[PDB]
Amino acid sequence: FACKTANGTAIPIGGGSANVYVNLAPVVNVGQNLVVDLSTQIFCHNDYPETITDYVTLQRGSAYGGVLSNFSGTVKYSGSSYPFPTTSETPRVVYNSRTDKPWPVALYLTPVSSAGGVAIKAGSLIAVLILRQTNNYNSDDFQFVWNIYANNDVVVPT
Ligand SMILES: CN1CCN(c2c(Nc3ccc(O[C@H]4O[C@H](CO)[C@@H](O)[C@H](O)[C@@H]4O)c(Cl)c3)c(=O)c2=O)CC1
């Protein structure tokens, strides 16, 4: 089991960390959701699918920077919504192919307060998302840590 990002950064067997720079809508109005879709940016696969089933959760999600300061929202994992920052580990998703498939995670973030300033700063850490991988073959229990950085500024006009 290993993963890679859209920019070509790999996290190998046994886990590790990677930086993911996410394209953000540059203007988000009061009452609108900012969508941070990681399913287009993070992909994983099973390295022995004929014999092993891999299990994958969103173990933890934490908010930082402008997201923590200025937004409130939820995380959607594999079709279900949960509080963000997270307060539990999600159910597990099966990975059963050598062909890469998305890690089905997305953030839905609503502005809390604004006076028209920069709500999210380009280059800043905005989230840490932990992917936990196990299987039905041995005792492997591995963490794939996705450090999420804003690729661009976001403004919430007023
Ligand atoms: C056709 N040939 C294929 C290769 N091959 C063999 C193995 N291959 C193999 C490859 C990767 C393995 O572990 C990693 O990938 C698993 C599947 O994603 C994850 O669950 C693990 O957590 C870990 O990330 C493991 Cl345990 C085993 C054997 O065992 C074995 O025999 C011989 C037969």
Curated annotation (Swiss-Prot):
Job description of the protein: Involved in regulation of length and mediation of adhesion of type 1 fimbriae (but not necessary for the production of fimbriae). Adhesin responsible for the binding to D-mannose. It is laterally positioned at intervals in the structure of the type 1 fimbriae. In order to integrate FimH in the fimbriae FimF and FimG are needed.
Subcellular location: Fimbrium
Organism per entry: Escherichia coli (strain K12)
UniProt entry keywords in alphabetical sequence: Fimbrium, Signal
Domain of life: Bacteria
Biological process annotations from GO: cell adhesion; cell adhesion involved in single-species biofilm formation; cell-substrate adhesion; mechanosensory behavior
GO molecular function, one term: D-mannose binding
The protein, known as: Type 1 fimbrin D-mannose specific adhesin
Cellular component per GO, a single term: host cell membrane
Family designation: Belongs to the fimbrial protein family.
